[PDB]
Structure 1
Amino acid sequence: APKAPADGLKMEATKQPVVFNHSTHKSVKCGDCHHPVNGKEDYRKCGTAGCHDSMDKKDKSAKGYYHVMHDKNTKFKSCVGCHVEVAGADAAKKKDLTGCKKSKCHE
């Protein structure tokens, strides 16, 4: 039961830095991004040691770091998923929300 920190949070652990402001995501259940782990809401690094440490281009599974922030066929929502369920009305933003290059995430 913390307090939505002030914007200015960016994730760049891998070879792809992606900024994310809670402001642009302050209308979503914290439980959407911060899923309950070991039966206890977790708000620590998504990756961290012990959790999503998998950082390869192939191997999937829940351990998959890029699989917990892309794939939509997961237990929990991702980043591209929600975006997919959103950027599915126009074939324009689809190249921005789910875009690979020039996208807000991978801009």
Structure 2
Amino acid sequence: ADAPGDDYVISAPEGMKAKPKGDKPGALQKTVPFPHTKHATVECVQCHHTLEADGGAVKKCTTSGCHDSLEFRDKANAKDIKLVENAFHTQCIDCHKALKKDKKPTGPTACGKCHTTN
């Protein structure tokens, strides 16, 4: 397939829950701009890890049967790879952090520097 342009924004799937603020209803984080051209050095398959099984078509990470949970991350389900927060954080953050350590061009590691659209 062809990668979308750099104006692309990743947001939470509709219905996505959020940790309540004690007793007050919580809210979602800001959305995340994601520029593919800045990740040209990474093979598509590395992120779109099920590409082959999906026959060359690129499916959204949250599609049914994939990281489809709409449940917020807590202690009880902290290890569940089906969670949106785990799927994206493991992919995005780990690489950025590792590159930062090696002192080379990298992406954001701070919450506010990735969740920006607002």
- TM norm structure 2: 0.66
Runs of 4+ in 1 over 6 A off after TM superposition: none
More relative contact order, 1 or 2 (CA 8 Å, 6+ apart): 2
Where does residue 21 of structure 2 map in the other structure? Answer: none
What is the deviation of 1:42? 5.2
Matching residue of 2:32:
18
**Counterpart selection for 2:96 from 80, 83, 91:** 83
Taking the aligned partners of 2:111 and 2:5, their CA distance within structure 1 comes to 27
Task: Give the C-alpha shift of residue 106 in structure 1.
Answer: 1.9
* 1:69 Cα deviation from its structure 2 partner: 1.4
Q: Bigger radius of gyration, 1 or 2?
A: 2
Q: In structure 2, do the counterparts of structure 1 residues 33 and 85 end up closer, same or farther at CA, with 3 Å as the change threshold?
A: same
Distance 1:38 1:24 in 2: 23
| Pairwise CA distance, 1:23 | 1.0
> 2:3: which partner in 1?
4
Write the mapping of 1:1-107 to structure 2, written as runs, cut at 5 A.
2-13=1-12, 15-16=28-29, 17-36=31-50, 39-40=53-54, 41=56, 43-54=58-69, 55-58=71-74, 59=77, 60-71=79-90, 78-89=91-102, 97-101=108-112, 103=113, 105-107=114-116
For residue 3 of structure 1, give the secondary structure of its aligned residue in structure 2: coil
Identity of aligned residues (%): 34
Shift in Å at residue 10 of structure 1?
0.4
Unaligned runs of 5+ in 1: 72-77
TM-score (norm 1): 0.71
Calculate the aligned-residue CA RMSD, in Å: 2.6
Aligned to 2:111, what secondary structure does the other structure show?
coil
Q: What secondary structure is seen at the aligned counterpart in 1 of 2:101?
A: coil
Structure 2 unaligned segments of length 5 or more: list them: 17-27
Equivalent residues, number: 95
Question: By how many angstroms is 1:81 displaced?
Answer: 0.6
